[PDB]
Write a protein that binds this ligand. Structure first.
Ligand SMILES: *[C@@H]1O[C@H](CO[C@@H]2O[C@H](CO)[C@@H](O)[C@H](O)[C@H]2NC(C)=O)[C@@H](O)[C@H](O)[C@H]1NC(C)=O
Lengths: 30, 245
């Protein structure tokens, strides 16, 4: 039903591309 | 959303728009959690004081959209609802405790570059990521195309001191400190939409929250308040387990 592949975006993670602001989220973990 | 930025195409492919059929009206945000299941806020579907008590045939959803008014041919999909499920302990009479609902689609939606489900949090992700200062992302329409804002989670005592509402363990709050003056906010109008976080453990996106109410933006309050999805996961699983396909 799609749960196994949840949360991985075809135009981003699947393509090894990052969106313009996801780095901000990663930085907030520092 | 206020002081956000334009979402890139396919940036938030779990985004769902909930509509009243007639008169045709956008009611709330929502999120796609599997090919048949959509998550939203209960107050979007049931609020008797405002004569809100929708049946399945009153509503539809549109999925894969990035434009608020313009038809997106061969991209956006429409789904009818088979059934609506509201948390049995949803508290509309005080504080919107357990502000959560599921909608089962009549037919599975096909996944594409623009349509893809978000993950429900597991114990590790809830424990590790739902911490003050960590940022999540809310998507919705501006107060036009889909807007995005990244917002830090607020310390629990700070959240409680910022509202007269009783904040329960089924809620969290997020947003920037007012006096700090960093911009971007989620609003009441974003109700039902997802607050998501990208896990640094497996690089997947998890829905940690649902916009339940906003006290800022077009009001003088500080923060947005979110249904804590993990806290209510036992209910979500009971519904999907019995009625999924
Ligand atoms: C609101 O309406 C309900 C009946 O409405 C149905 O209830 C189910 C179960 O909660 C819900 O999934 C559907 O949206 C509804 N429509 C159907 C099945 O066609 C009344 O029984 C209540 O008295 C009303 N008020 C409240 C507060 O629930």
């Amino acid at each position: 039903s799609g749960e196994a592949d949840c949360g991985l975006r075809p135009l981003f993670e699947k393509k090894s591309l990052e969106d313009k602001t996801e780095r901000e989220l990663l930085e907030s973990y520092i | 959303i206020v002081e956000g930025s334009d979402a890139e195409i396919g940036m938030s492919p779990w985004q769902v728009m909930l509509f009243r059929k007639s008169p045709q009206e956008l009611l709330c945000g929502a999120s796609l959690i599997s090919d048949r299941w959509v998550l939203t806020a209960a107050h979007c579907l049931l609020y008797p004081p405002w004569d809100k008590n929708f049946t399945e045939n009153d509503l539809l959803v549109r999925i894969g959209k990035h434009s608020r008014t313009r038809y997106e041919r061969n991209i956006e999909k429409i789904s009818m609802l088979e059934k609506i499920y509201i948390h049995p302990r949803y508290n509309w009479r005080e504080n919107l405790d357990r502000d959560i609902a599921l909608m089962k689609l009549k037919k599975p939606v096909a996944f594409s570059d623009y349509i893809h489900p978000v993950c429900l949090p597991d114990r590790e992700t809830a424990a590790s990521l739902l911490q003050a200062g960590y940022k999540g992302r809310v998507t919705g329409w501006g107060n036009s195309v889909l807007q995005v804002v990244n917002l830090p989670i607020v310390e629990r005592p700070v959240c409680k001191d910022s509202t007269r509402i009783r904040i329960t363990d089924n809620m969290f709050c997020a947003g920037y400190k007012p006096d700090e003056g960093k911009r971007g906010a989620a609003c009441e109008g974003d109700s039902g939409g997802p607050f998501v976080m990208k896990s640094p453990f497996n690089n997947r996106w998890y829905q940690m929250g649902i916009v339940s109410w906003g006290e800022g933006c077009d009001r003088d309050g500080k923060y947005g308040f979110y249904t804590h999805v993990f806290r209510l996961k036992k209910w979500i699983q009971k519904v999907i387990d019995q009625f999924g396909e």
